[PDB]
Amino acid sequence: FQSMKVSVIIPTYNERENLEELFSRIDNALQGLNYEIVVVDDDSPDRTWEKAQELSSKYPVKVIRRTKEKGLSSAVIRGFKEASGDVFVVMDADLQHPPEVIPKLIEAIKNGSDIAIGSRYVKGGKVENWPFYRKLISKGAIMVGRIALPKIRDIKDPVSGFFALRKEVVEGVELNPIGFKILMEILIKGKYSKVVEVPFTFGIRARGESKLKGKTIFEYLRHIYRLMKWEGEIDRIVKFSIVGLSGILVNEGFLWLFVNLGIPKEIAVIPAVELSILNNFFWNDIWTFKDIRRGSIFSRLLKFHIAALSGAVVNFIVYWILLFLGIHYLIANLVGIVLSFGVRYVINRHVTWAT
Template identity: 40%
Template sequence: MTYPILKNLLKTPSGSLQIPLNPNGEINGADQDNKTSKPVQFSLIIPTYNERGNINYIIESLTRLLDPFLPNDYELIIVDDNSPDHTWEIAESLTLTYPQLRVMHRTEEKGLSSAVIRGWQVARGEILGVIDADLQHPPEILLKLLNCIQQGADLAVASRHVDGGGVSEWSLIRRFLSRGAQLLGLIILPSVVGRVSDPMSGYFMVRRRAIAGPILNPLGYKILLEVIGRGNIETIAEVGYVFQERQEGESKVTWKQYIEYILHLIRLRSRGRIARLRQQFNFPVGRFIRFGLVGLSGVFVDMTLLYLLSDSTTLGWELTRSKIIAAEVAIINNFLWNDRWTFGDLSSQQRGWNQRLKRFLKFNMICLAGLVLNVLLLNLFFNIFGINRYVANLIAIALVTVWNFWINLKLSWRVTQVK
């Protein structure tokens, strides 16, 4: 089936991710029609990527709900990240049937959080909301959220963890990861995460005046953290909902989203100190955090092998030999992850097995130099100071982590920075 191409797409804003206080406010690169458009009470952003199987149904469902509740006083804005399945073309064709629908097709940026903010930047509503296009967020909950805002709340959140909330068919592992992420958030940033029962919710609405002004800097999928952490949110209401299973398309939740969630918490916790540190010392803090997280996986590999090789209940090998073998396996583990993730933007510029082998040899030599220091420190702490071998090993690893990161950044992946 072919769809009419209307070329009536919203222009994507550029510059900082900042919401104007006035719905017709000036935004770099934003759609200029906003200046003459009538403000509406409610603007709902629907970020999409490969959602052609769901888009028609979600628009029809939302329209059926909102037309009698807010007649001619709302808008739906689809923000599509250049979907390979051409979701934006289907959405644009729907504007002939649904005049309240507007479509933005992004080609220069990607990511759910920034998609939502770009949509809010061109929105005309005094209330700004977001809902997934995959039907996992029940549309009927919108009316309850709107009632909460109309009764005075600054932020209304659909929650899986209050009365009436839950998940439909989640595995035990996914439930564990979700709850674990929330617990970790309470430890790192209790002042933000502790204000809502479901800080990882992607289904909510907020008053424009409560979020307008600050420059937003979201990371990953969890934009609610950014709204609470940087907005002027006083009153929060929560409405229970049951998270539904996807009917069409594929889930976009991966392990990467959990890592980005942790990094986002750290960024909010720093209150700008990380950015100032980066500017003052030109130190790539974000890359170092990724390097450290990879290092944690290496610690697990290292400690496990050290136990299997050296403990008297297993092979009972001599400590130094066991440490060298365990460390080398951990080095290989760390290189693979760092080459793919920590320095992935750099290594992608130097493709091929020869280039990867060169990076691995450099990485190995630098880490072996760190290993010499690590072994010396391990024996010092264990044999001289009598510290438990595993605690001594953790201390030694921590002391050489900064060395390994900085030298690897300057040498192992240096060639990929040359233009």
């Protein structure tokens, strides 16, 4: 069936010795199929391009050398432009991504998926000779993305450099050239209705230096922020804060009104805070999250109370921990309120108004 064309897009910087092994294993994996290899090199101080062309004698290789541009994601964007296939396959050149699982990726695509992700973290997925710490940092960084970007909440390895997609997913789509995690750009901005993750083993690099470890983490966080903006999450967070501010005023307002009407201070606090919660739910339901209301309004009201209570607990615990660590009580209090707001937003975004 793969009379349809497959383009294997490979970004390279100083990837030399690996090419011979790479192309060999790729060809054997994709034996007899209509495929091309598209190498995108940013004028390596390295011979290859050169080695690439030479294997063009034996392998269907298209070589793109760019002198004006640098960057991993930028190269992949270039690959999409230069590729002529119906299905794109993106992978590294160092054999950490095994060419032998490419058939499973394209098979998923033929079976009806728009994107097939080579994933280290779904059932079956593994990583080879990783220290436990590095594995934590990885899944920890991934967790941040899944929570901050609800669209990829259920993706286990959204930062993978190894994936396949129908050309339709990214044609007509403007992808941001900055960064490394091109898949995350695609998951957010691409056109698709079905993604699957396919387990594989992230193997040992065989030969050559590493060019990205570690130069990725704070870029990754700025990438997340750009995507939060794009998704309207930043907008929701600002509106949520504004509502939250109004709630503080409403709380103090009723507290004053109640005690001056002959109601004891430590009795008046209860209706005052509950009214502030009701106030906060109301504006968030008709403004902040108006477009993603589901089910009964009472069910949302109850979930909102859970988030509000969770916020108060986080605020309490954070404050005292910081006080025990020797932090000034005003800073401690500030951080408590900020983390409370953060937790309340996350719980309301993922539970009260879940998507």
